[PDB]
Symmetry: D2
């Protein structure tokens, strides 16, 4: 009873290294036999392809079977720009953006088409929020819109641009965070807002794309990725700790854990699931209180 993505190909948007959720899903899709195409942020591209050439990610490419993951092709990409006319002359003039081409959503999509003709899976693992450090109360309109644009609308833009080249019976999947439904102080600059929009769109799109092309649309609401810090300082480190303490099952969360769920979800096994927000967070979201609250001892 395997997850079989043999003869299927995925496009994974949001891979810059071996340390995020994105890398993890790729691994999983690859373990299940899918053909892997990557979309890399174009400021990040170089270092990415360079370390990959050099073998830097070799240990991070080991599959269960022991073989090594293959990335059939790396595509540069800035998901805040749909078409080329949209780019600010000042962006197209930046060294980084100067070094590559065909990096708009519309362009990436045209390439894939020209290169492979089709796809079966779409993975969104993107996000970005300039003022993510500030509270809403202190978030600028521009910093807020930026988070929404890169973190929400990007999914919409990708889905619509790739849809014409998705074989029906295909699936897409995106990564969300519970700061959409509940107050998680620290996750500011409109990221929370952006995660809320993403989720809702997940539903709508499941309708739009389900009816339109028989495509499944789902999002996975993950936990803080990683193991404990010797000194939990900063937001993520903190959440990791908090979650380790307060969750129904006491353990840490691994990328592998999120990737397997993803692979499952984009797989045929999951033919009856769409417009879902799946929690893969060690059951944290379900708790009413924190176990570690000082009142309880």
């Amino acid at each position: 009873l395997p997850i079989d993505l043999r003869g299927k190909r995925a496009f994974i948007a949001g891979i810059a290294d071996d340390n995020g959720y994105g890398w993890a899903v790729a691994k999983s899709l690859a373990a299940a036999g899918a053909e892997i195409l990557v979309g890399t942020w174009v400021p990040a591209l170089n270092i990415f392809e360079t370390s990959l050439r050099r073998g830097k990610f070799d240990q991070s490419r080991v599959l269960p079977d022991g073989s090594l993951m293959e990335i059939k092709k790396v595509y540069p990409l800035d998901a805040v720009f749909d078409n080329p006319e949209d780019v600010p002359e000042d962006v197209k003039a930046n060294k980084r953006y100067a070094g590559s081409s065909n990096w708009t959503v519309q362009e990436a999509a045209e390439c894939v088409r020209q290169d492979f003709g089709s796809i079966d899976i779409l993975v969104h693992s993107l996000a970005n929020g300039p003022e993510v450090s500030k509270p809403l109360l202190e978030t600028s309109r521009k910093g807020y819109l930026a988070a929404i644009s890169a973190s929400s609308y990007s999914f919409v833009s990708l889905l619509s641009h790739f849809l014409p080249i998705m074989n029906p019976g295909g699936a897409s999947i995106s990564l969300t965070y519970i700061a959409s439904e509940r107050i998680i102080p620290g996750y500011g600059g409109g990221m929370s807002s952006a995660k809320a929009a993403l989720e809702s769109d997940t539903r709508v799109l499941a309708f739009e794309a389900g009816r339109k092309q028989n495509i499944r649309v789902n999002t996975i609401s993950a936990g803080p990725l990683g193991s404990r810090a010797a000194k939990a300082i900063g937001f993520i480190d903190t959440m990791i700790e908090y979650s380790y303490n307060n969750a129904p099952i006491q353990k840490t969360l691994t990328a592998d854990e999120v990737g397997n769920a993803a692979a499952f979800l984009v797989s045929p096994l999951a033919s009856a699931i769409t417009g879902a927000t799946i929690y893969v967070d060690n059951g944290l979201n379900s708790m009413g209180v924190a176990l570690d609250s000082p009142v309880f001892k």
Copy 2:
């Protein structure tokens, strides 16, 4: 813009003293001019009516206007028994149950009818759970069913028995607790389960009774009632503390607070609200983490 329940009468099930949510709603309904009828648990009846005669609740009956609340009539009542044939000879033989009569749901309802002919508001403020101290894992089938019977089904039984005598455009309201949707360790013996059922039934009944008699059906999901203990020991004391610390608005919760919401809800002002779970818990339910978790300092 007043809440006007002048010329309306409420039946409040679950009043044994001046210290619970039930007393609070009565006060509120009474401030708004409703005619107050009480249903008192029949083990509790005596002490109740006795202290009330004696003036023991006088300070607790003060209305805003300064006058004193009036209870038009106290009806004894055991909401685990619908009809008289249902009572175990061993219950009917107990001193307490021996002292009163017409205490089944079916009987109480017949009385009211014979005494007043009609009602407009129905308040459920009942609950009871023998093994509420044990974890589900350790809850007996009998202790579990008991919680459901007294805490869930009782609402269903009251609604159905009173419905024929409720003027259309009337409303009912019940008290719930968030341990239905989220894990709140400590609230065991099937109370959690019982609160879950109640809520769902709230919805269904809103459908059944809305369509049947133009009756609104809602539940209020409250916080731990009361102010701080010098030594928070025990479940409630603990929750009060926890909530005071961790809530979006830092303050305590008062019965008045729950009563006003109730009065509002059963009032005509609320003509577009039904099949709702209203949170009156200082916004606790909305939080993702506890502020007091030691990881955060």
Copy 3:
């Protein structure tokens, strides 16, 4: 048991006429004795103040007591612009925007301050979405961002700009729609998304502002406003019909209905409610199926 907003003042953002939810809440706040300040979209301002001068809204200003609603002051306002430096020379050059002044969020707020010094209630009744007619799949990035900006971020901008002048123990309230949580085909152009963000922000802000200034933050998730069309054509007309048929309580929805809930919510009676999404939609949101589905007869 009245809703008393005597000696309180509200600022209502999003009044252009007597036909929306906004007008309704004002009425309600006014019935409860609050002092009414309006923020009018500045393209709409003129016609507004003109018809109001002329008596056009006289029948729509009748309060329950029989008297007539008073608007202490109308302030022009475009909630997509925070500070004056933000305005495009091409907007400031448009006849309409040319006729008025002090219309940025930052400016409106400064005025109020200079005119009244303070406020107690904040009402957001704003929304706008250029491509609201298109499906997400066909919504432009710009049309999507526009909906979010005018429909989501505007609340954030108002709250933050007015906060310094809100007496603690005050409240704000905004209008939402269930297309945030569930698929409602027809409500496109990112409005759905925008309603999702608003809700989430409602929660966060309740935290930010609750802790910061003892301000309550809530949103009301309303139904389609209005009575039946002889020919339900178009989105709203359709929803009205659908809701009339399928709701747990069969009736239409009136603005009065939404206004009363609002008044209640911003009132002191509601001191224990924050980070809530209150449904005032005749219980529609709670249903699992449509009664009118042809399968059921």
Copy 4:
């Protein structure tokens, strides 16, 4: 990337034939290599084992690999009775119950232990509700309690009785229905209530058992199982039709579909998922309106 339950054994409670969800999950678990133990209702036992002997289920036992499913052992079982002292002399005297032995939850569990020593997976596929045809308004207290007992508490009883013999890192899974969260007229007699309780308990137990033995606890909220009737008459037939029409993805639902999700969930791949209600209903739960409502054409 397989779902590997090689060297694992499951106990499936609620198998009486090849036509329910229960049969389906067994198949799935079996495809993934788990060792299958069945708990059969003891009125149903005989016909079950008889047709199975005879080959009646042969076509229904075909695995993907082509081989045939094996049931290592069938255990009789009535999940409304925990211990033998609990049985009414009038039940133990009924032909059916007379023919078998060790059929209480406590007894079944002792047997398994004595026969296999341990288990890894626990599947609950049980339900039963005498007055399921009546509306709550017309449901008896006894008919209501019966639904809860057989449909809710049974899970609690099984979990607790099997827990001592579950290898840590194991999982349990139960089948729920959306009539718990939303009004689905027709699903009466307290089934709705019972499904609500089950879900909540799913959460709590995930806490209790997660912390206690490192066991994952989840429930799957399924759609109406089956394909279209030529004449949709009756509740299920109706729901199937309705769902086919109104769902985001237009298709029917197959048992296979629910089984695969289950297998996944009880599998190690799912190590970060617990206290979840997974929807496997073709995305129906996410919709706001019915597409087939006559208002929309």
